[PDB]
Structures are given as C-alpha cells and as structure tokens.
Scaffold this active site. Structure first.
Site, PDB file in Angstrom:
ATOM      1  N   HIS A 292      37.282  -3.671  39.758  1.00  0.00           N
ATOM      2  CA  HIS A 292      38.062  -3.998  38.566  1.00  0.00           C
ATOM      3  C   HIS A 292      37.499  -5.182  37.788  1.00  0.00           C
ATOM      4  CE1 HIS A 292      41.662  -1.540  40.042  1.00  0.00           C
ATOM      5  NE2 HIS A 292      41.365  -1.082  38.840  1.00  0.00           N
TER       6      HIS A 292
ATOM      7  N   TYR B  27      39.654  -9.518  41.214  1.00  0.00           N
ATOM      8  CA  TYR B  27      38.810 -10.074  40.167  1.00  0.00           C
ATOM      9  C   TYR B  27      38.539 -11.551  40.429  1.00  0.00           C
ATOM     10  CZ  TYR B  27      43.709  -9.512  38.921  1.00  0.00           C
ATOM     11  OH  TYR B  27      45.078  -9.393  38.961  1.00  0.00           O
ATOM     12  N   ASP B  28      38.380 -11.904  41.699  1.00  0.00           N
ATOM     13  CA  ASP B  28      38.173 -13.272  42.138  1.00  0.00           C
ATOM     14  C   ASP B  28      36.772 -13.421  42.721  1.00  0.00           C
ATOM     15  OD1 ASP B  28      40.790 -13.290  41.413  1.00  0.00           O
ATOM     16  OD2 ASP B  28      41.598 -13.647  43.422  1.00  0.00           O
TER      17      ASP B  28
END
Lengths: 642, 643, 111
Positions: free
Chosen positions: B148, B113-114
């Site tokens: 995600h 989630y970066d």
C-alpha cells in the site's frame, strides 16, 4: 577457466577458444609503441590494470620465462606482531569505513572481542548501499566467526581450567551473552551469499568459499605429493601456495586465520616440507657421495618461516620435528630480523607481566606463541643484548602457572647451547637466584614437573665458569642463623657457589644415614678416613646380618676410584654387582645381565668402555641385539663401545 | 496443546527450514509500537471538516468516505499537510519485529505504510518494493513488498492507498504489484499476522481465492490475537472458506487491554518448536529415523563417518561402530532405538507398518555395522568383505556379464563401471549417455547424479590420456574416432562440475546431503587430516620405544581404509582412478606395515605379561595383498623392503 | 584395562593408573603416594655421578623428604582411576624385574 595462472607468476592458455585477450594485453604492456593508439580513458584504465597486476605479481606467459624472482612480502601489521602499533592505531580517530574494518580486525587480534563485535555490527548497519558489499559481506562473515569463537571460549573457559584466578573472572558479562544469543538466535551463514544482489553474485564470485565451513581441503589433499619416494619442483609450488594463502588471509583482515583448521594445515605443510627435504638429503648422501653432496640440506628457511613456526606450532609438534628431522644441520636465514622479532615478543611479555592488566583470552592466545618462540630460539645466533633481554624476560616475568623452574631451566640451557655465557647473563642468573633465596624466607616450596631444581643452575654456572664467586649469597649467609632451616638447606643445595668463609660457617650448621644424605647432594665431596671406617662398620653389620638398593652405590663409589680401602674384597658374597665392580677379573658373568646397563651415566660408561671384561660386555650386547632390536642397546654399542 | 495447533506448528517449521515462508504483516504489529492508527486521522478529518466529533456514527465505510469528502472539498494540499503533521514522528522497533525476522522468511508482504518493518533489518538485505517502477529494478531475489505505497518518496497523499477512490481503482492503478502478490501467495506458504478476521484485505483475498480451483493452493495460516476466545461456528466457517486459524487466546490467557503478551507467546512457541522435533513415543522415533534414513537405501554401502552429516551433528559416529551423544538435547532417539533393538518384547508395541520400517532400519544398520553405544560396547568384532567382482579381478566374469543384456538401470550402471575398468572407455561413455538418457524416470535421481559425475570423470580421464600419453614413450595409437574427440569437447564444454549439485531439486539437496562431497576432493580431507595426525603419533611412539599392551591406534586407520575402499567399490565409482587415492592408500599401508613390524619384536612381553594373554599380532590376507599390488609402485615397495 | 600400562625401552619401566599405600621402615605407615621418574643422560653431574634417571616420591601431591630409603614393606595398590586392588599383579610384576621401582605415574624425557 580461460587461462591457467601458475603460482610462480606466469600464465598459460588453457581453454580460451576465442581471441587471446591475455596475449594482446601482455604485448601492450611489453612495448611502448603499442600504446598511444588508445584514448585517454583507455590509457588510464590500462595504467590502473598494469598497477594492479604489478601489485599482484603477474609477469607474463611461460614462453617468455626465465629466472622468476618470486620474492614475497606481507605488509599487514598484525602479522609481525607489533602490538604497540595496533594499540596506538586503535585509539586514533578513523576516517573511512576501511579504517573502521581494519580497526575491528586489530581489536579482534588483541582480545577485545566485545569492541570488535560492536564495531562489526556498526559497520554492517552503516554501509549497505552501493556495490561495495565486498566490505559489508566480509563484515558479516567476521562477525559470525567472532561469535563462534566467543561461544567456544565460554564452553572451554568456564567449563574446565579453574586454575585461573577465581572463576576465570567471567571475561564476558552475562547480559552481553544474552544479547549475543538473542541477536544470533537463528543466524544461518550458508544462505548469506545467495540473498545478496545478483550483480554482487556475478562480480564477487570468488568470495563464495569464505562462507563455507571448510575451505582448505584442496591444498590439504594436494599435500600428499610430498610423500612420493620415487626418484617446477613440488617443494617450490607447495611453499608458494602456502605463502599465497597466508598473504590472502592476513592482508584482507579476515578472522578465519584464528581457527584450528588453518593451524593444522600450516603444521602439516611445514612438517611434510621438512620431512621431504631431509629424506632427499639423506638419499642423496647415501647414493651419490658421503661428502660430495656437502652434507648440508638445501631447505633454507627465513624470517617468514620462523614466524609461521612460532605462531602455529605447539611444543610437541616441534619435538616431533626435532627428533625426526633434526634442525641442527639446517642453516638459518637473516638473524637480525629474527632478533628484532624476539626482542619485540620479550618486550610484550614483560609489559604484560608488569602492567598487571592481563586479559585471559589474549593470555591464552599469546603465550603459546611465546613458548614456541623461546623454544625455537635455540637455533639462531643472537647478540649479547638480545640474549640478556630474553633471559631477563624469561627468568622473572614469565608467570609461574605456565613455566615452572624445571622447564625454565630447560629453556635457558637450550638457549645458549650455541650462544655461550658472557658476563651479563651470569650476573642476571645470580640476581635471580639471590631473589629466590630472598623469597625462601614459612609454608614455601618450589614446584617443578621434571624433577629439577634451582641447584642445577649453579651447576651449569660451575660447568661454564669454575672460578665465579657470588658475593650476595655470602652476604646473605653471613647473617644466616639456625632458627629458619629451609634457607640453609637451599644454601647447601648451592654449596659450591659460596666462598670458603661461607662454607666454613655453614659447616658448623650441619650415622650412615647422615653420610648418605650428604653424599646424595654432595656436601662431603671428599672421602675422609672416618667415613671409610663407617663404611667398613656398615658392611660388617650387613655381613653379620646375613632389599633396597643402597649398598651397590658403594661398589660404584669404589669402582670410581674414590674409596681407597683394601677391605672391599672381603665383604663380597651376595650380589654379583659388588663382585663385578670390585673384582671383575674373577667375576662370573653367567649372573651378569644388561638390565643395570641402562642406568650408568656418561662418565661410568666411558670408564667401563676402556677398562680391560670388554669382550664379555661386547658379546652380551651382541646376543641382546640379536634376540631383541632394542634401540638403547644398539645406540650404546655404537656410541661407547665402537 | 491442541493436536491441530501442533500440526500447524510442524508445517510452519518445516516450511521455514526450506525457505518457503512468507509473513503477511498487518497493522496491529505496527500499532504495538504506538504508531498513530488510521481512526485518529479519520477523527481529525471529521473535526476539521464539520466541527464536532461523533463516535457512534463510525461504520466500516465511513473510514473511507470521510477522507474522500475531505479531499474532494478542501483539495490536495490540506490532505498532504495533515498527513505530514500526523506521520512525521519516528518510533522504536518492536520485539515482535525481531521475532518475525528471526524465522528467516523468504519474502515479507506488508500492508503498512511505515518504515518500522524496514528499519528493523539488524543486518538483513531486502529489496523494498513500494511503487510501480520499483518492481522492474529489483536488485535482489528477496522481496519486502509494501503493498500500500510507503511514504519513502515523500509525504504526499498520492503515494499511498488511503481514500475510497484509490481502493476502487486499486486493480487499474497497481496491476504489477497485485500480480506479484498473487504469485507469491500461490507459490510459498503464507502466515498472516496482526489482522482482524473482518478486515477488508482478508475479505478481498478470500474473494479472490474463491475463484481458484478446489485444490491447487496451500491454505494460509491466520494467527489471531483477540481478547475473546473464538467461537466454534465462526472458526469452522472460516476454515471452510480456506484459512487455518491459530488463536493466541485459549493458549495463554490475559486481560482485555494487553496485546504484546499474546503475540510474544505465539512467536516464542513457534521459535522454540522450530529446533525441537515432536517425539513422544516409539512410533515417532522410528518414523523420523526412517524419514531421515530411507533415501540412503539406494546405495549399497555408505561409510560410517558421513552418517554424522545426515543427522546434522546430532550424534558422533566412531569408525569402530559405536555412537556418542554430541549435540542432542531432545528425546535421544538413539537410546530408545537401541533399547527397542535389544528388547524383543517392546517390538510388539508398534503398529505393523512401523514394525516393518523398524525391521528395515535394523537390517540397514546391521549392514553398515553400527553396533551399539559406547557404554554398552564390549568386545566388538568386525568382518571385512567386498562384493565387487572388479575388485577381485576375475575379468572373464564381467566379460561374460557385459556380453548379454542387463535388466535394469542399476545393472546398466554396473555395466558402465565394468566397461570403464575394462579399458573400453568409448563404450563406457556411450553407455553412460544411454543411462542418463534412459533415466527420464526416477523417484530419487541419485543414479542420474552419479552417472553424470562418472561420465565427467571418464571424460577427464580420456582427455588426459590422449593429451599427455603422446610422447611419454608411445613412439602412436591414441585410438578414438576423430568425430568423437570434438563431440566430447563441444558437448562437455559448458558443463561445470562445481554447480552441478546446486542445480538439483530442493528435496535432493535435503536428502542426499553427503553425496555433494563426491563432486570434489572433499570426501578425502576429513580422513587425511586424521591420517596425518595418527602418523605423527605412531612415529612418536616409534622413536620413544614405548610399547602399548592395550589396543593400538593403527586399527582406526585400518578401519577407515577398508571403509573408504568399500564405499568406492561397492557403489561402482570411477573415482578410484585418480592418483590422490593411490597416494592415500600407499601412505596408510606403509604406516600399517611399519607399525606391525615394530610390534613384531618385544623384550619383556614373554617374561611377565605373557601369562595373562597375548593380543599382539598382524597378518596380510588376500585383501591386503590386492591393495598392495594395485595402489603401490615398485620403488616404494623396494623402499619398504629396505626399511 | 591394562591399557594404561605403557612399557618403555631406554628405562625398562611401567606406567599405570594406580596408587600405592606404601609403609616405610620402622613401622612408619604412609598415606597414598606416587613415583615420578625423569630421564636425563646429558646432566653434567659432579663427583657423585651414577644415575641417569631421577626418581621422586610425592605424598598427597607434596614433595616428601627422603632420609632413609627403606620402604621394602610392599603396599596396597589401588587403581586410582577405577579403584581396583591391582596389588597382586603389582607384586607379580615387581618380583619379575630388577628395577628398584617398577611403576611410575609418568616418565619425563628431558633428553
């Protein structure tokens, strides 16, 4: 494929099976009553489309044709080579991304490839949004091309050509080379177009061919038509297509213009066009009339054609063009703009030599154009100031490692053939030779490739100005001593230019070997009786002796009516050449063969042509031509003996 | 290295070259950039909730239970505040990110989630999918699938799958993304990275892949980077479950706390082996040569020049039959192949199937005329022979050959060419349509492509003949069925020739690479440029009067000419119909005739060098005569007679 | 290998890839040297005007001053590229032509 857009500026329906939108649009643009039936947004859209078509040179259908102007112009600053303008525009602050793209192209054109690559990377990083990929995409292409060029330079520069100072200075650092290899380790350009958004692929379909490694195959193949020997014109369509390609490549700031493929295409097109023009002219004059056609070729070429020839032609290609398709019968165009181009390029070379901050890549990319421009400048009438500036740039500031004394003598002599010699260039040539005398002060020796030296310059001056006297050489030679010998050797090599007092002074500074050495360069121009007595003594020594060719020169000298002696008839008996050159009436021509015929110069052949043994040489030439079709024999027969 | 690792590397490289590689980037790669891991947030939640930490009671389920308790007790605002506080930092990209991007993957699936794997693309365009509405507005065809829920839309906790309830309702909340992931996994070749062998996502994926059929999937590759070298039983069990494991350990070795070096070693090995071809002994050389040559067996003859395109510029091929190393850095398979050809003893060191394939390769090279290298080349003699009946011009022959029934599709293709050169263009189009229809079966597809091109060519020929030859001197025959003139129009309307090759199987675009040039005038440019250059050179020698006592340049031109003609006629192609080919032939022959005429007369040849020998000479035979009579016009013949 | 040999028409000469170990007169032995010929029929010469082509001799790449042109002592010819004693053919051909210098490295056409 709905409509065929011919290059001249016309459109034709080809495969449109629906409503004829092109016809409706052109009817709307043709009349005013057609307008005002459309809304404001439609009005402004039509205005914008009309402006775009006006800028792109689209006129109407072929039915409403007649006298299409077809005048081309390119407003890309890099084409005209105004390098100072690029230099001043680069330093200025850029506002939008388009100015950044143009700055990157200008930096690439100036040899600052490092900043060009960094600017392209920055542009690619900054602008990725919106449907303006037309910049982004192009940026990528340019970057890749630059990278290719860079690596090619390395594998061409550090591999061969150690004549440049040091190890070519390593123009690009090793750290940047490693970073270049890291960033472009596996970059593939063939898949660049496919990965872009599908709406970009739908809209900008025409830009696909830029990603291909070859994109001039169609025009190169279509170039074949000019070879048709059978009896719009194809020259017009070929030339207009070439102009279209050049405008598209240069105006959009694409680096693919700096590759070998484009140069080869340009050279092929220009050479074929000139060949077709000359062949048509010669066939017309042979068939129609000797002077009815006017004996003037109709292929006029102008500033654009001259700059293309200068930019994309090497020396040998121009040599081929001149020996096969001689341009002296081809008329020039606007001489003023050509003069501006020449003075600009001369200013550029002067600045480059003077500032001493040369760049190797730009050096290589520019002096090719420079040499082509000066070589082709022969066929243009030029003002006195331009001639002086060009000679000043060429004689002194042209680096030695590319232009030597001999080829510089070629350029200068080729430049004035039609320009004559006003006082200014004689003054500047005198200054140059005085400086050359100064540098002669030693472990110094001039180097030339064509066997010519500085003496020729003086001879040329004496050819044009018989009465000119150089005072500076007189001042130099008044203080001249005998400790250093090479300088007085140059002084005898420039004997005629000096004054009578200087000649008498140097006469004190100087067997048959001495006489031969003096006569080879011509110090003792006259034939004193003492020299004739030495001639007789040498001939008697040879006769009592009875094989280098040293004595036939003496028979040639007697043949030139320069030896007033009656003893030359009594020293014959060995060589047929001596008998022919002394007693041709009783000479036996069975031993005569034309091998020595290809050695005399204009004066000797002119003298022997009017001398009456003429039937013997005419029949010798006849038989030699019949057995072998030698170019030299037939040429000499026509020019001297007919 | 281990043989299985070599096989896996070879398969990965082959998939990468075909644009069928997808990287499943894990969480360890983002950890290498010192991104705050999840356990830090778990401990922070434990501290803010209870008051004291405890590492001992940290099982697998606690990592999801603790955040869920925090959300259900404290609420939503505290969760978002903590997430914003701990995830607002920005970090530099990793060298591993550049290394994975340098492999050119078609899609990149990541559970992070970066933004690191995005901010790493450098100048690469990827359509980022991290939500539900983003799968409908896919602007491109390359997917950066953030499975995600990236933080792009904000730092709220409802945009990312962290807590346990989100993991439970993953299928009901994200059906589209799951379907897309499964489709991508089923289609392309998957390579995992940065994952622990016991991670939840890998177990879930294995559970899903259990339901599939025994066959019909490609086993994903798992690159494991753990300090302890893997055990044999665990490796064999996981291989049985459907993974192919390559371990960073047991290849380089290092201490326990270092992670960057193992990833770097694996990726450098992959990248280096990408360009390298694994060749050790003669069998690999012959296998690779046969693999890259065999599709060309369908054609009768191919010209020597475009061979340089088949080998990807690995070896410059000269017209005379010699080859020169150009861009080869590996084993140099040409050298070893030539040594094997020369020495009969070493042929006994090959297995039977490789011996047969080498024999076929040698026969093919002999038919093409490839002789040897430049250094070993001595006196090379080349014969000229074309086996095309239509080329010779005995029209009764293929008349009685088209009279009866053929035996195969290639025979029918010959019939089509013979009919086309016999003038019955209607029957030619009919039989080409019959061919392209009777070809639903093909192991190569080359006949289909060639027949389509020839059908389009004859279509253009009949269209041009009908449209132009109406007032040229006809005055009217233009004999064709009225329905036929509209049938060719409506049928051959949408058929674009530029995109024909772009729409063929992905292996056809990989094996028959040269044939693409047949779709345009490309197959002439590479030779016409050389023709123009050599024309200029020969005319320069003409003007300067220089005589060469060695070997003349014109031979090269001659060779090219013959090769082109053979390649155009032995393959039964209608492209010889155009006038560009005629102009090219005419120019080449005019050059050759002029050069020969100039070389006929000499001055010092008899007196002097004549004792040493006499190589000079030129001769017109049958071939030259038929080419002159076919590809020349009367006026040009008169011009050359005058010259 | 005589590929190098290029024979001209307007000058009737040879161009090779060989080198000469000439011996000058009066037992003056020279190192390796070579000839270069430049053809110029449009030279505006003075009262001494017989030759159209200028011949120059260089030893070790340096211009060697000529005072006594009496190098009629043959040489040992070495084919500079491949280093072969072409000398025998060198005589074979020089005894068969009337040109004073049969072989030059190249001919420069200023015309």
């Amino acid at each position: 494929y709905d409509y065929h857009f011919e290059v001249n500026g016309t459109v034709v329906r080809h495969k449109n099976k629906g409503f004829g939108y092109m016809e409706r649009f052109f009817e709307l643009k043709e009349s005013c009553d057609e307008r005002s039936k459309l809304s404001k947004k439609q009005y402004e859209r039509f205005n914008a489309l009309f402006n775009f078509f006006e800028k792109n040179g689209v006129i109407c259908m072929a039915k409403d044709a007649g006298t299409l102007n077809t005048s081309i112009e390119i407003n890309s600053l890099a084409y005209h080579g105004k390098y100072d303008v690029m230099k001043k525009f680069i330093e200025e602050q850029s506002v939008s991304i388009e100015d950044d793209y143009k700055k990157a192209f200008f930096l690439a054109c100036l040899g600052r490839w490092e900043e060009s690559y960094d600017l392209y990377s920055n542009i690619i990083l900054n602008s990725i949004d919106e449907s303006n990929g037309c910049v982004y995409y192009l940026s990528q292409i340019n970057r890749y091309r630059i990278y290719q060029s860079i690596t090619q330079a390395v594998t061409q520069f550090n591999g061969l050509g150690l004549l440049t100072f040091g190890r070519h200075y390593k123009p690009f650092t090793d750290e940047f080379l490693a970073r270049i290899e890291r960033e472009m380790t596996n970059f593939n350009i063939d898949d660049l177009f496919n990965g872009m958004p599908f709406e970009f692929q739908k809209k900008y379909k025409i830009l696909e061919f830029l990603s291909d490694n070859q994109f001039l195959y169609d025009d190169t193949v279509k170039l074949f038509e000019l070879t048709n020997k059978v009896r719009m014109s194809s020259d017009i369509v070929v030339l207009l297509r070439l102009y279209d390609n050049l405008r598209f490549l240069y105006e959009n700031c694409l680096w693919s213009v700096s590759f070998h493929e484009f140069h080869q295409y340009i050279r092929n097109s220009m050479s074929l066009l000139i060949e077709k023009a000359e062949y048509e002219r010669t066939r017309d004059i042979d068939e129609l009339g000797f002077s009815f056609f006017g004996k003037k070729s109709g292929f006029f070429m102008e500033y654009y054609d001259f700059v293309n020839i200068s930019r994309h032609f090497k020396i040998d290609d121009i040599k081929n063009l001149e020996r096969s398709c001689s341009i002296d019968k081809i008329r020039f165009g606007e001489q003023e703009k050509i003069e501006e181009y020449l003075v600009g390029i001369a200013e550029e070379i002067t600045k480059q030599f003077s500032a001493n901050g040369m760049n190797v890549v730009f050096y290589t990319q520019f002096i090719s154009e420079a040499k082509a421009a000066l070589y082709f400048a022969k066929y243009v009438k030029l003002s006195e100031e331009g001639l002086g500036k060009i000679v000043k740039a060429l004689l002194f500031y042209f680096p030695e490692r590319d232009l030597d004394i001999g080829k510089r003598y070629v350029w200068l002599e080729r430049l004035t053939k039609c320009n004559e010699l006003p006082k200014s260039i004689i003054s500047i040539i005198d200054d140059f030779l005085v400086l050359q005398a100064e540098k002669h002060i030693q472990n110094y020796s001039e180097v030339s490739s064509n066997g010519l030296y500085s003496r020729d310059y003086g001879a040329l001056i004496k050819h044009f100005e018989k009465n000119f006297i150089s005072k500076r050489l007189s001042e130099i030679t008044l203080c001249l001593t005998q400790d250093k010998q090479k300088q007085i050797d140059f002084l005898f090599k420039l004997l005629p230019l000096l004054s009578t007092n200087a000649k008498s002074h140097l006469l004190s500074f100087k067997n048959i070997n001495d006489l031969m050495n003096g006569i080879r360069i011509g110090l003792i121009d006259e034939f004193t009786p003492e020299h004739e007595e030495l001639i007789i003594e040498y001939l008697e020594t040879r006769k009592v002796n009875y094989s280098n060719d040293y004595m036939s020169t003496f028979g040639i000298w007697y043949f030139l009516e320069e030896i007033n002696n009656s003893k030359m008839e009594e020293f014959i008996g060995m060589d047929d050449q001596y008998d022919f050159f002394v007693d041709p009436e009783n000479f036996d021509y069975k031993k005569f063969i034309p091998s020595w015929l290809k050695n005399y110069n204009d004066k000797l052949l002119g003298k022997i042509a009017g001398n009456k043994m003429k039937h013997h040489v005419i029949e010798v030439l006849k038989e030699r031509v019949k057995n072998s079709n030698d170019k030299r024999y037939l040429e000499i027969l026509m020019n001297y003996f007919i | 290295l281990d043989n299985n690792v070599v096989e896996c590397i070879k398969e990965i490289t082959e998939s990468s070259r075909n644009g069928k590689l997808v990287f499943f980037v894990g969480a360890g790669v983002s950890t290498l950039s010192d991104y705050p891991q999840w356990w830090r947030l778990v401990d922070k939640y434990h501290e803010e909730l209870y008051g004291s930490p405890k590492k001992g009671n940290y099982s697998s389920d606690e990592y999801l239970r603790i955040p869920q308790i925090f959300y259900n007790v404290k609420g939503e605002m505290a969760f978002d505040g903590i997430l914003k506080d701990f995830f607002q930092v920005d970090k530099p990209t990793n060298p591993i990110h550049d290394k994975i991007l340098a492999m050119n993957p078609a899609h990149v699936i990541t559970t992070n989630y970066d933004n690191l794997i995005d901010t790493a693309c450098r100048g690469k365009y990827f359509s980022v999918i991290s939500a539900e509405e983003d799968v409908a507005n896919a602007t491109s065809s390359r997917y950066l699938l953030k499975v995600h829920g990236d933080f792009r839309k904000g730092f709220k906790g409802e945009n990312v799958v962290l807590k346990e309830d989100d993991y439970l309702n993953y299928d009901q909340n994200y059906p589209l993304i799951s379907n897309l992931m499964k489709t991508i996994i089923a289609t392309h070749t998957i390579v995992f990275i940065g994952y622990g062998l016991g991670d939840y996502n890998i177990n879930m994926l294995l559970n899903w892949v259990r339901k599939l059929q025994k066959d019909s999937f490609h086993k994903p590759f798992f690159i494991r980077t753990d300090p302890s070298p893997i055990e044999n039983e665990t490796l064999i069990y996981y291989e049985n479950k459907g993974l192919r494991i390559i371990d960073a350990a047991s290849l380089i070795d290092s201490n326990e706390y270092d992670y960057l070096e193992r990833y770097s070693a694996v990726m450098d090995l992959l990248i280096e082996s990408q360009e390298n071809k694994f060749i050790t002994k003669d069998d690999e050389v012959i296998d690779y040569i046969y693999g890259k040559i065999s599709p060309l067996f369908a054609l009768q003859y191919i010209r020597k020049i475009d061979l340089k395109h088949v080998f990807e510029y690995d070896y410059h091929f000269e017209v005379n039959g010699t080859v020169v190393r150009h861009k080869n850095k590996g084993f140099g398979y040409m050298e070893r192949f030539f040594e094997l050809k020369e020495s009969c003893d070493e042929r006994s060191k090959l297995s039977k199937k490789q011996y047969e394939r080498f024999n076929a390769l040698f026969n093919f090279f002999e038919k093409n005329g490839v002789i040897c290298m430049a250094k070993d080349a001595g006196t090379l003699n080349t014969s000229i022979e074309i086996n095309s009946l239509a080329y010779h011009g005995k029209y009764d022959v293929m008349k009685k050959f088209i009279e009866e029934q053929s035996v195969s599709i290639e025979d029918d293709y010959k019939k089509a060419f013979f009919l086309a050169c016999l003038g019955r263009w209607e029957e030619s189009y009919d039989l080409y349509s019959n061919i392209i229809l009777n070809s639903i079966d093909e192991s190569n597809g080359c006949v289909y492509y060639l027949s389509q091109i020839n059908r389009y060519r004859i279509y253009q020929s009949i269209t041009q003949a009908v449209t132009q030859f109406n007032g040229l001197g006809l005055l009217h025959y233009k004999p064709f069925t009225d329905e036929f003139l509209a049938r060719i129009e409506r049928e051959m309307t949408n058929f674009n020739i530029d995109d024909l090759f772009n729409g063929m199987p992905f292996e056809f675009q990989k094996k028959y690479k040269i044939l693409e040039f047949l779709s345009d005038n490309q197959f002439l440019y590479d030779d016409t440029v050389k023709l123009f250059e050599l024309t200029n050179k020969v005319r320069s020698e003409m003007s300067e009067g220089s005589y060469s006592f060695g070997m003349s340049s014109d031979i090269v031109v001659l060779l090219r000419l013959y090769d082109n003609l053979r390649f155009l006629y032995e393959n039964c192609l209608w492209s010889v119909s155009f006038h560009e080919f005629h102009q090219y032939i005419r120019n080449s022959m005019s050059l050759l005739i002029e050069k020969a005429e100039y070389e006929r007369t000499r001055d010092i040849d008899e007196l002097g060098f004549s004792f040493f020998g006499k190589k000079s000479g030129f001769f017109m035979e049958y071939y030259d005569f038929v080419n002159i009579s076919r590809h020349f016009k009367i006026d040009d013949i008169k011009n050359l007679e005058r010259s | 290998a005589t590929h190098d040999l290029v024979y001209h028409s307007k000058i009737n000469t040879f161009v090779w890839d060989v080198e000469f170990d000439i011996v000058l007169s009066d037992s003056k032995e020279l190192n390796k040297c070579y000839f270069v010929k430049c053809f110029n029929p449009y030279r505006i010469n003075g009262k001494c005007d017989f030759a159209v082509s200028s011949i120059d001799i260089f030893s070790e790449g340096k211009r060697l001053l000529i005072e006594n042109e009496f190098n009629f002592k043959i040489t040992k010819a070495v084919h500079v590229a491949t280093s072969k004693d072409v000398t025998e053919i060198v005589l074979h051909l020089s005894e068969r032509i009337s040109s004073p210098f049969p072989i030059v490295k190249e001919v420069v056409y200023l015309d």
